Each structure stands twice: as C-alpha cells, then as structure tokens.
C-alpha cells in the first residue's frame, strides 16, 4: 500500500539535515574554485578534479 511507503517524523528531519549540509559543502567547493585555490591532481585537468570532488560530495 502507501502505509508501506511512508516514514515517521524523525527520519524526515534527518534527511533534510543531511541534504542541507551536502548542498552547503558543494557551495564552499565552488566558491573556493572561483579564487583559483584548487590544485589539480596528477593526470587531471582542473575541470576534472572539480567535478570529481563535487561528485564525491
């Protein structure tokens, strides 16, 4: 049914919190890449390392 597709009130808050913190970290990564403070890794373009760590996050 749909009673089997729903959660309690505590879990929703936890999911919102972790999503907010991830969307936070991505912003710090972006804004520290706009001041040329990123260092590429061996065999990786700057775009490559940026997108790699944002995909990690």
């Amino acid at each position: 049914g749909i009673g089997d597709s729903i959660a309690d009130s505590k879990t929703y808050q936890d999911i919102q919190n972790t999503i907010k913190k991830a969307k936070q970290d991505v912003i710090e990564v972006i804004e520290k890449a706009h001041n040329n403070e990123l260092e590429p890794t061996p065999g990786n373009t700057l775009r490559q390392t940026f997108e790699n760590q944002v995909n990690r996050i």
Binding site: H34, N35, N36, T45, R47
Partner: protein, 114 residues
Amino acid sequence: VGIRFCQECNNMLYPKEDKENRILLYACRNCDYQQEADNSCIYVNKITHEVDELTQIIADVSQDPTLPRTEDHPCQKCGHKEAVFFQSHSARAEDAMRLYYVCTAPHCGHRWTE
C-alpha cells in the same frame, strides 16, 4: 609584426635583403616600390597563448539580463557597488575558472579580474 601595403598598387609588401648596406628592404612583387624596415624583425609565434581576455571582453555585456550580479565587489574607477561577473567562455579551458567582472554603472565599462 604587422603588415605593409604598397603605396602604388595597394598590395602586400614582401621583405627582401640587399647586399650593400645590410638593411631590411620591403619590396613589392607587382611593382618594385621600396622602403626600409624600422623594427627589423619579421616572424613571431606565440605558443604560450596566455592572452588575458581583459582585452577581448566588451563593456556592453552589462546589459545582459541573464548574468549574475554582485553587491560585494565595487568598481574602483567610479565607486559603483554593483558588478556582473562571468567565466572565460572561450578556449584555453584547462585551468579556466577565473572570474572576470564588469562594472554596471552607465558609461564606466571598467573591467578587472581578481
């Protein structure tokens, strides 16, 4: 580094060498108009290609309604406290995540990176 046009038939002046006074002479191959070279260099090839696009972006980009704006970084030449920033949007995109700004005050057009 530039180019030279003939003064008679308006064509391309080629460089030539004379074995008398050791000076570069620019000659034509339709007529034979002559003159000497002032810089005495012909060919240059820039491989670094590190041209700063501060010499290629236009001042009227601040009329674009689809670009982000900022209240933090003000203009130096006029003191306006509103700018519009963007990226290189060109080639040489290996480490190209700089952020060029343009003042949005009318008739300022000041540009600067950071």
